[PDB]
């Protein structure tokens, strides 16, 4: 069961696989087989779901046997399973969606503290391992805080989040 | 030898002489594809002969004997003007609208003798 | 009696077949892809109905010529970057003042960004001025140009249409049979005599001659919208020469393009011309003259005028021969009025972009042929036509017409028949099977 | 017991193979070459086993059909030297808004060192603007443009398709056939029926009527990713036209090449439209509804959704009335919610840079007020896929896949082949 | 007359008697090149039935009789129940598992039937 | 089974007996034409061995005497040593020049049976 | 003793006929459309006669690969807006000096009247200076490049010729087969195994071995204007590559039509180097000039000298592999003189527009391949040109040659032979038909 993670608000490829190599008739759901996206022939046809304006396949690469499933603007909500109907199988991938920001967007003096919030999507269990160009690699749970806070400390903070050996890096805006 | 169609104007009992010179002359891009064209064409044109002449139970003889009586509805004309007198061309012309009855009567005696001697050859 | 099934009856009929082709640089017609040839048989007491108008042969001869003509020209240069202005002045170097023009234009070279200003001898139908004046090509604003390849010779080479196994040409042998009606003396034989497909207006040349007396072969000799179909029985050979001494120029007009365009002339500029003799011509048009006779009374005034009118294929005696198409005025043959050492010179104009088989949007270039080219050929025939009479009047005028190429393929396959065999024959005997 | 051999057995297996057209001026499918047309075997005592969704014979007609369009297409104008920057205005001569562009361009004439500045009326769907604002063609960047021959038709003439020489085609006839499983009465024919090769999405047009009730035929019903392809018996007729009265206008693009574009709209600009009896649709909804409950439940709320979206020619019912390609948006009349003399309009939108069904095709606009009546003879239903605890089905029109319009009609047909050798017991045996 | 596979249901026995009926219908740009390979396709398996009804022994014979014996393995049932109550299709389906090594045994005992026949003639 | 001519070095007799598996090997874009001429090109010369087989009263079967006698020398040897050593190719090689002649003589024979026969069948 | 019939017996008679393919992504070469392969029988007693410089099967195959060839590049990129004045610079980041050309020109885009600054990098061979310089493509002003399509592979798949039925294949085993006489050894199977399209010359690369010793194979050993089709027992493994890092750049010709660019380099500019282990290379050497003293005599001097000279295709050994075209300068290879853990490396070079046929007016441009291209193939074989000599020296120069392709295909058809089967046989045996 192949898992990708997002940065809520990238795009996103899950890609179905044809063994044929041609334009086989394909289909994405989600858990709740609730249609996404779909081919009929050599149009698209969009499902009745909440991607509606977001969900998109690339039509040049299902010649090739490849139909992707493009997510652009991703949500926090946006985190399920999602099922390839290519010729009969059930090719299925879960998307997780990660949201790591902080309160303290500018407003912060030499002295204080740091504090940061992660957006877990429910039901998942995410480790976060901050990292920093003065060297603080801050391990903790969902939830990191910083108790020192002066000139040396800027820099943009690389803090990337795990969940089961995957790892998806992020940025922050830190300026002192 | 009178060659291919030599004795078109010769009577049928001479005629029936040469089948056999009429008979081995029945099988052998723009002109690429006409001349492919042409060979499937005659081959069809012959096995459709030989397949008539097959299910009739006369494959492989060029005169072939058979047991449908000849109806005087076709021709009421006697042996001695028939194979001395005509030849095949006019006696084609005759009987062309009652070909294909005589085609099919054909068919079922020789399916009926077919029948006919297996049932025999198994007491 | 009991039905007997005889297998190899001499039995045909009627029908059409798709005949190929079998003949002994690359060809325009292809014959070296057809079947190596090889004949007759004669078929004694046998009476076969003709008809050289219901031929479909001449038909498929039709067809085959116009698509080998046109599949030979796709592997051939495109000149299309020929459709540009060009600015011609009047060549002077006798009468074919205003025929040739001095066209120079702008050309593109093997670079796209490139120009190249070259300069062509283009012949006065080949131009038509734009309303030093600016002409451009005739046939600019109807079609896409085509330049034949230089390699590829229209030679006509005698081609035999043979048919396919299980089927047989027959060929009527009466010595004075007019194209329709029973053929007392037919005969079987494989391949045709050898057709050579020139195409020609006006004069059926270096055709097949008659036997015995020229005939005179119409599908309705009473009807004048049907063409008169004349053979000869004695060839009245034409002398056609292009005095012009041509010089070829490549021009290149792309990678791996190459246009070939007329030079500049080695001498002096003449008229070509046909040359036919005076004496044999007029021999012949007395013979002509005698035996149409028959179909009109011998009381009658027959006729003889130039063409009617229309498009320059079908107003002058058009032919190819040695690769120039030649357009041959021939008022000066038609002209007597026959009742109860010296030569005749026809002028011709040259022409060189061509639309043969009078198609919208497809034309060719005959690309010019170095030197001086000669041309002796046979007339063996004529197509005449008869004018629309008042039925109150004593004198026929007859006017060449002809265009239609079908006409000139019918007066070779006019004594042929196609036919199918049918071997399969049942008859009454007293065989009976055990 | 000795060995017997029989030649010309009843006996047949499923086989793929190559079928020839056999048609009923020239037209896109070809009329010069299919063979002129000629019948009918019933096989009583005998029960074949049919399959509509893996049957050769739809690929094969798509194969057929694809083929055809794209070598009628080839001996016609390339339109390459159209991609150049139009210069474009509305025009302005009420719900055409802004729908047609008055566009003017620098084209080539006959003559390759000179320029002619020409206008055309191109509609809205065919250009795309470059940021009187600078336009292009819209299939410019991704594809090459040949227009169509205007010469050719896109008349969908009947083609039957015959089986070779030693092949034959079962046609069931069982009236209840839903397309799988054992047909009880089974025919033989030597070619199949006239088969009008419509292209249309969302609405099959102009197929054969079925009998008995309006016939619902799924590749798995259950699945909420098949098409559900629906086969009426009343035909409900559609009136679809163009009021514009539209003038073709000839450019020279090049010699011997021309390009017929739009010119000037004599008289008022108008909307294409098409209309559909309320009462006799509401009436085929109604028997649609009554079939379709068989599957899901008596007492499911059976609702009808217009397109949910996508391309536009799977999100509009798309069609060729008499050579302008229609876009009609169909979200009146898939509209309703079903439970336990007046006419719908339907506004359509025509795009001439219409993109093939396989590069794009040009459609030459046509001379004069184009108007067609039509028989929806069957409709292309996507299930929404259901959360297990809802009672409702919301049905949305579906279609694009153009295997899926053939597959309406080549339904009840199956090639087999003869195998006519077969070997049995007897008590005969060989002197 | 039923017509071109009219027995189809009708049972093996009842079937047999129209072997002609499905015998003489064994013969007969985008389209030309389809008609073309058809026809080829066609004569090829016209002729392929036609050659192994040769080395059979069975040339231009409908209903040929054999001397290989019929091994109660292939099928158990009795001429009754086979010739009165089952369909050439059954048939068909019940030995298809078997059908390679009846042409072969047909095939070797044609051979030995044959090369006993010229033993014979040489005396 | 000496493999398809594998008897080609072995006695004529040999060949003799293994001409079944010969017989049966007669039948069965760039490449597209190449394999379609090729099909027509077999099917055609197939038949033609077939049909000159045919008209030699010898349809159907892969060894059938016949009454032409051995005319002139022909390369006459005797029949012991021929069909005990010598080879088919060899013998091929040396009768080469009276092919023509030889299948004359049988389709003549073969025209002259026929004709007794259907003489005879009346009676 | 009466004329007895026979059908089917095994006699044949050599004539020539098309042979099919059958194969076990698409290629140049259509094995996709080949039909699925599946059968070997020894014939006992069998003397056949072989002559490998008149096998028609060459010709056949030659003819094919060449129409395979130009079938797959009918519906790829035409690139004649490509035939522009090219302003160049030397690339500057080495021997490989100049040899990469970084070029920049006018180009159209998706409009017609809007152009384009693009840049692209050509090798020098690929570009001639016009009299930063300006240049074109070395073929603008001779022929009209098609560039090969992106999918499309060079890859020499294996393909399998099987006569047609009616027709048998016979192969033969002999071990000591010199290409011409009797081969007492026949086998016949209906296809050809071992059989793969290879483009080399010079050097006859993932051919088939000989079996025991390395043959000399000449249709004449005393002519010198003769080739020599030397074929090895042991292969001599060639390791080579091109180092540079390609990076694939697509720039629009038009509308729906990319031209694939070599756009840059990534790391440093490395000459593409042809390695084979000298040890190897010089025992199969010390091998092969063995066996070329036999027909010459062991006091005989054998000299190996590199191309004399000519064209770049026949000059160097030039192969096609991982879709780049080399063309290995073998200078390194042939240079020693032969009296009765290092590896050698050879200085390739790399072209991209290329006329692989000698056809004139045709060539072809290969898409770069992204990426680092290494290819292992292993050397089965040589094509030496002996110089004519003065008929009185000791010494004997073997320079490579080739440059047709027939020669190089002929190393793998030389043991087939193609036979028409006459199983109609007339004799007399003691019958007479009752
Ligand atoms: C002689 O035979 C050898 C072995 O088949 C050939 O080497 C092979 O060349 C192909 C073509 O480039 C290689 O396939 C390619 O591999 C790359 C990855 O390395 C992949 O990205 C491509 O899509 C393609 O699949 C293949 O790996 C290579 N094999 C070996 C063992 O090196 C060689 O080209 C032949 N020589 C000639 C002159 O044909
Ligand atoms: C032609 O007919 C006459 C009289 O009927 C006859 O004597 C002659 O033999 C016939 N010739 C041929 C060749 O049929
Ligand atoms: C060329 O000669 C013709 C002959 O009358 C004349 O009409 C025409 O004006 C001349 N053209 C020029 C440019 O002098
Ligand atoms: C035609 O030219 C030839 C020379 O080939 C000559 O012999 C003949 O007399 C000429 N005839 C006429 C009528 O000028
Ligand atoms: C007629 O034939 C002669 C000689 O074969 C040739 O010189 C002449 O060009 C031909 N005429 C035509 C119109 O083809
Ligand atoms: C018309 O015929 C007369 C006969 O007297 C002749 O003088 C005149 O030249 C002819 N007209 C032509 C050939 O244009
Ligand atoms: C033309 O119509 C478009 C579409 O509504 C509108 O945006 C634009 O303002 C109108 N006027 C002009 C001059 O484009
Ligand atoms: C459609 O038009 C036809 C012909 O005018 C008419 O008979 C029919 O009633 C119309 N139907 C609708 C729904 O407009
Ligand atoms: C079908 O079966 C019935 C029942 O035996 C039989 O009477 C009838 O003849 C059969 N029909 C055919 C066509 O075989
Ligand atoms: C570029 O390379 C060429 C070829 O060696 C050489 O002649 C030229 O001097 C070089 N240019 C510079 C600036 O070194
Ligand atoms: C090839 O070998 C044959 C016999 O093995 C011999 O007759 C012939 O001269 C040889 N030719 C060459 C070129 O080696
Ligand atoms: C090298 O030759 C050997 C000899 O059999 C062969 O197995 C191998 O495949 C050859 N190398 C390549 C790359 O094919």
């Known amino acids: ?176 | 030898f009178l060659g291919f169609l030599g004795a078109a104007g010769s009577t049928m009992g001479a005629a029936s002489m040469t089948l056999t010179v009429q008979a081995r002359n029945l099988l052998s891009t723009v002109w690429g594809i006409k001349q492919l064209q042409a060979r499937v064409l005659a081959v069809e044109r012959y096995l459709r002969d030989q397949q008539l002449l097959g299910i009739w139970g006369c494959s492989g003889k060029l005169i072939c004997c058979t047991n449908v009586p000849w109806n005087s509805s076709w021709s009421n004309r006697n042996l001695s003007e028939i194979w001395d007198n005509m030849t095949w061309l006019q006696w084609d012309k005759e009987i062309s609208n009652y070909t294909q009855i005589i085609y099919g009567l054909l068919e079922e005696s020789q399916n009926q003798q077919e029948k006919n001697e297996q049932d025999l050859l198994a007491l | ?434």
């Open chain 1, 1 to 176: 069961k192949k898992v990708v993670l997002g940065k809520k608000g990238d795009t996103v490829e899950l890609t179905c696989t044809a063994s044929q190599k041609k334009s086989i008739q394909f289909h994405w759901k989600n858990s709740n087989q609730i249609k996404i996206l779909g081919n009929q022939g050599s149009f698209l046809t969009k499902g009745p779901s909440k991607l509606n304006d977001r969900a998109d396949s690339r039509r040049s690469l299902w010649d090739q046997g490849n139909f992707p499933l493009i997510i652009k603007n991703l949500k926090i909500e946006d985190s399920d399973t999602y099922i390839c109907e290519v010729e009969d199988q059930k090719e299925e991938v879960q998307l997780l969606v990660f949201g790591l920001t902080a309160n303290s967007d500018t407003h912060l003096l030499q002295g204080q503290s740091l504090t940061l919030t992660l957006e877990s999507p429910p039901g998942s269990s995410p480790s976060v391992q901050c990292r920093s160009p003065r060297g603080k690699n801050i391990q903790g749970g969902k939830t990191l805080s910083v108790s020192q806070l002066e000139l040396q400390d800027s820099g943009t903070w690389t803090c990337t989040v795990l969940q089961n050996q995957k790892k998806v890096e992020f940025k922050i805006d830190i300026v002192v």
């Open chain 3, 1 to 434: 009696l009991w039905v007997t099934v005889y297998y190899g009856v001499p039995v045909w009929k009627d029908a059409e077949t798709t005949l190929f082709c079998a003949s002994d640089k690359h060809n325009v017609w292809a014959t070296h892809a057809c079947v190596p040839t090889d004949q007759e048989i004669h078929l004694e007491n046998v009476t076969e109905e003709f008809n050289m108008w219901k031929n479909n042969m001449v038909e498929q001869m039709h067809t085959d010529i116009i698509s080998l003509w046109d599949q030979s020209l796709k592997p051939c240069v495109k000149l299309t970057p020929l459709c540009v202005t060009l600015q011609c002045t009047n060549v002077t170097n006798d009468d074919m003042r205003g025929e040739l023009k001095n066209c120079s234009f702008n050309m593109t070279t093997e670079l796209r960004d490139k120009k190249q200003k070259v300069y062509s001898l283009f012949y006065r139908l080949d131009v038509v001025q734009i309303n030093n004046k600016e002409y451009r090509l005739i046939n600019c604003n109807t079609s896409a140009i085509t330049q034949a390849c230089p390699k590829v010779s229209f030679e006509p080479i005698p081609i035999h249409y043979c048919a396919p196994a299980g089927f047989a040409i027959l060929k009527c042998k009466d010595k004075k049979f007019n194209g329709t009606g029973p053929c007392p003396s037919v005969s079987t034989v494989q391949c045709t005599h050898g057709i050579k497909p020139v195409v020609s207006t006006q004069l059926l040349l270096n055709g097949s001659l008659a036997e015995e007396e020229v005939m005179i072969r119409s599908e309705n000799i009473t009807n004048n919208a049907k063409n008169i179909l004349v053979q000869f029985n004695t060839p009245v050979q034409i002398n056609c020469t292009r005095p012009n001494n041509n010089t070829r120029k490549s021009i290149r007009i792309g990678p791996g393009q190459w246009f070939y365009a007329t030079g500049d002339i080695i001498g002096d500029i003449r008229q070509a011309h046909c040359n036919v003799s005076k004496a044999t011509w007029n021999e012949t048009l007395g013979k002509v003259v005698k035996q149409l006779r028959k179909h009109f009374g011998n009381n009658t005034i027959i006729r003889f005028a130039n063409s009617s009118g229309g498009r320059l294929e079908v107003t002058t005696h058009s032919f190819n021969c040695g690769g120039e198409f030649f357009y041959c005025n021939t008022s000066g043959l038609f002209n007597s009025t026959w009742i109860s050492n010296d030569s005749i010179t026809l002028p011709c104009r040259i022409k060189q972009i061509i639309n043969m088989w009078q198609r919208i949007g497809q034309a060719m270039y005959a690309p010019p042929i170095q030197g001086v080219i000669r041309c002796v050929s046979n007339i063996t025939g004529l197509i005449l036509t008869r004018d629309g009479g008042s039925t109150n009047s004593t004198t026929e005028t007859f006017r060449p017409g002809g265009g239609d190429m079908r006409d000139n393929w019918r007066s070779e396959l006019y004594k042929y028949k196609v036919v199918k065999i049918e071997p399969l024959g049942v008859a009454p005997t007293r065989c009976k099977r055990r």
